[PDB]
Design a protein around this ligand. Sequence first.
Ligand SMILES: Nc1ncnc2c1ncn2[C@@H]1O[C@H](COP(=O)(O)OP(=O)(O)O)[C@@H](O)[C@H]1O
Ligand SMILES: [Mg+2]
Lengths: 319, 257, 255, 253
Amino acid sequence: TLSLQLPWVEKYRPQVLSDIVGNKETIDRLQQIAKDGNMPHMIISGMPGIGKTTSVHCLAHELLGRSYADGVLELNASDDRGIDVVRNQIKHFAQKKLHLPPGKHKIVILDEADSMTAGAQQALRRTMELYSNSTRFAFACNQSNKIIEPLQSRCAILRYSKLSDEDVLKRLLQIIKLEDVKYTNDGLEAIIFTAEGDMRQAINNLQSTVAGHGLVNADNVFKIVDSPHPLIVKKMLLASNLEDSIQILRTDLWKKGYSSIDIVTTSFRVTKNLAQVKESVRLEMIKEIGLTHMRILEGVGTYLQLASMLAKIHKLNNK
Amino acid sequence: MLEAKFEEASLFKRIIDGFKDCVQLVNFQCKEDGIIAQAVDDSRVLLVSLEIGVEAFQEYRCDHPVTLGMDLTSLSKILRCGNNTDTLTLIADNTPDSIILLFEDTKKDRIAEYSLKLMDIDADFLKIEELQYDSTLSLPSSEFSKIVRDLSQLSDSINIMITKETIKFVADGDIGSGSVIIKPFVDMEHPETSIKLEMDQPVDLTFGAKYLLDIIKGSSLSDRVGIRLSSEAPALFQFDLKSGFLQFFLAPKFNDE
Amino acid sequence: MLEAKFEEASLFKRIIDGFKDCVQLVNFQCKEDGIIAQAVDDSRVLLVSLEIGVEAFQEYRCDHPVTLGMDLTSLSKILRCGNNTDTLTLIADNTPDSIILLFEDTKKDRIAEYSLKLMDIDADFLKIEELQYDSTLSLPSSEFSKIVRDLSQLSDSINIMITKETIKFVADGDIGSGSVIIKPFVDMEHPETSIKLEMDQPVDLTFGAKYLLDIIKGSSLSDRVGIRLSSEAPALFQFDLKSGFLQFFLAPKFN
Amino acid sequence: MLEAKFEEASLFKRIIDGFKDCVQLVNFQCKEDGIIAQAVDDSRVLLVSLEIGVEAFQEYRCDHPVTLGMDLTSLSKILRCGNNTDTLTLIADNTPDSIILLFEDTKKDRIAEYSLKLMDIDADFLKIEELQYDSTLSLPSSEFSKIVRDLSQLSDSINIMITKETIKFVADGDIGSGSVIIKPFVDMEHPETSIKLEMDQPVDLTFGAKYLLDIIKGSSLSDRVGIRLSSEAPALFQFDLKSGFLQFFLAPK
DNA sequence: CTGTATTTA
DNA sequence: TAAATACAGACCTAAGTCCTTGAATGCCGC
DNA sequence: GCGGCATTCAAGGAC
Ligand SMILES: Nc1ncnc2c1ncn2[C@@H]1O[C@H](COP(=O)(O)OP(=O)(O)O)[C@@H](O)[C@H]1O
Ligand SMILES: [Mg+2]
């Protein structure tokens, strides 16, 4: 081997706002903003792999044309979160003179904006206030709560949601058409099912399946990509008899190499997000799983503790 | 288009060094007469004015009065690269987005072309009206710089007292105080270190020590300082050039009761 | 038993100060022909290869090949314990352990005995690079260091371009841009000022600024540095010593 | 009243710089035959005792013992006003509130005036016991400071050995070891760089590196420094220029 | 939540 | 003088590391 | 003798 080829995430990364299959309303708003100009300050939030960084990148490209090189300051906020960075480099770029078309502005992209420190986040407010007529800020984060309220006060807020199955399927079919890949409907359904609304993860799984087996079929997908781990745990707690829950814990989880701490964390998360049972039952189950987790975190993590967890949950469900 | 050629780049290097620690962003206005630059301090307490005439350049060119918004830190970084024996050429094209600094060696053919991005400085053009003062003297820059450096170690406030043709510099701090008394004298064989003073009214002002240090940091463009006092007006601290000057307008303290 | 006796004690200090920031741990290979050393940066971006022959040593005795694994952050302090007019002596027993450094004055009578505990670096360092490059230039070390430190302020990436009798350093950053252009000239009145260039094919590639600043820290050894570039090959920055040389194989950035 | 016309401001500048980072606020006792200064660090390991006689001054006048409390940092900041061509004049009155320092130049048109406000500090009694010391060495101050700064890099504990008329400074750290060995030296051509040694019993002791680094700060006072070692008494570190002298009493562990 | 400051009825 | 709503009561310490960040220390360069 | 930069460390915050 001498070299590798570009991954389908990067090779088929959209370069225009039309190629994005995300939320139609916000994408159309971004297209209209790019067509008209006067882009306002914004923060885009959502879950990983739904088209947040790509959307802002294509928006900046379409807005600035050939002036992207000298009009876009793209920094990973987690990479550069120091208050000194905002004080010196961001400030100098904001005051920098640049002759631009009468509807376009310099764009500051702050990727992973949720990781910025408090000092830089507070220092950015006056920087974005005094140079708001020639410098525009677009934050890309996963949690809006990590950004201070005054920072959110001066900008538009774009909450991206999980991609629907139809959009992911359409993008996947477009990729297969552009790559000439042998596929099966069951394989694409499995890819979507294990994607859980993350387009990047779906694309990566599809590319890995093609490179490893060649045929996108459900059997191959489940062989190379395991089924979502929380679903087995959810089936495990919701068992009617203790024997079945013990069997799932033994075979699907313990004999497959899943660590005890992972199992207890997944059970905690599933019971937190569970909706089939009542509130009191859920809180009592979380109590028992938390006690077992406390036992595991001391290094007592074995199969006996998880067996006791399931037995005590089944006692709780036994009225 | 503008193409201004200096005699030594070190001259502009010292000019930029003189007023780089007080202001940060300066509008350089270029006209057929020369270059004028006025900048207000971030605290709006010390104003910096600078004039460089057409006779301070080896070659001068201007087709229209042009404004250049420059950051002094970046300018110092660019000018630090040059040496003492290079010709410095400032070049600006139409629709100025950046300024080119050419350093040309006279003994070799090596050329160093640097680029500096301009800044948008939304500052108003004000007029520095000249009015007759009450006291105007000239004393060597080095001595004044030494007095400021010794007196700043006690307090941040400096009282200037010109009375009875005596100059009194007072620094009243937390630990003791310091007083410097100067009597003007005319020394024949070198007038360079003489003190030429004209006093009409005895003036009592008070200034900030930090601004005084920022002003004396420019004690490399001349031998003496033209120091002009006024009781209701900011004082003028001037360093004369071959064809221009560097003035500092320093607003005094509040002379309460 | 390794026993080395230098001409001047500051020459080893000047050698080690070149490696002070770009290298942490080194494996000195001691043989009958001299001391060899090869090291890789923590980021594995530059490679340092030092060779000092028996000429630099006033005395030399190496019974068998020796491997001395040592840390530079301590040897720098140990050499800083000497003087400008001292002489240095390296002592190592049959089994490599606790290298001994002896500082002796020639004007007076003084003995400075220092010890350094060795460390076992498992990775071996014996690779040698012998390949023709597209361009070979030579310029004074002070001038090259001046350009590197002057253009490092503009950005973190410095592009070197070799074209027909033209040498270009470009540095484009956020505060502006800069370009230094030189021509190869021959100075008969002083030979250590002239700049030589032999090119086979034009080159254009970019390095990081901080690694260049670390390499130019070796300018205190030789007054002239050679710079060898090739396409898809590491760049060779060579300071020639009296008995050997020191070479940095520094790797460019991906385009 | 107190009127002390110094020979040069640089002399007092260096004498004050000798113990910058040792103590902060101390009281100088000024009496007719000279000025004494006693200070103790909070670690209770070093005693700084500075005696300056009348002969060290170009003019000295005082008729009543006085105590003058002051902070070292502000005093040094005041001395920064001095240059190489001005002389110091210290004026104190019967009511200690502020010392008046006058800088006098050869040209009578440049006269400087400054004031130093006194602070009140609880003084400590004098440690002037002359207990017998086993060994006595005398070595150049610059060389000694060089050895101290060299051995402080390896370990924080410097071992001093006076043994078989050999002087050994040992610094065994985690990265390695250090050993500087010197022999007695008498010179007839430069009577300032010599290694004088008078040994009665061999002396083995260990001292802190930071303490010795603080002591060697007074190397600007003298070209050579005299060290007296005892196994049961604090070691003495002595600098002197012509008549004014300074001692550090280090209590070994 | 109670309790208080502010605005408008 | 009542509706009508905002909206304020209050801020913890040991501990573990990692991170930032101001400021002092430290050294080299000039 | 300052001037400048780099390094280190302590104070607060977060989980
Ligand atoms: N709505 C979408 N339409 C098309 N491709 C998408 C979409 N969302 C994500 N992708 C793919 O995911 C890759 C990177 O996604 P990215 O936008 O960085 O995720 P995030 O939104 O978490 O930043 C891109 O190469 C892109 O092809
Ligand atoms: Mg992203």
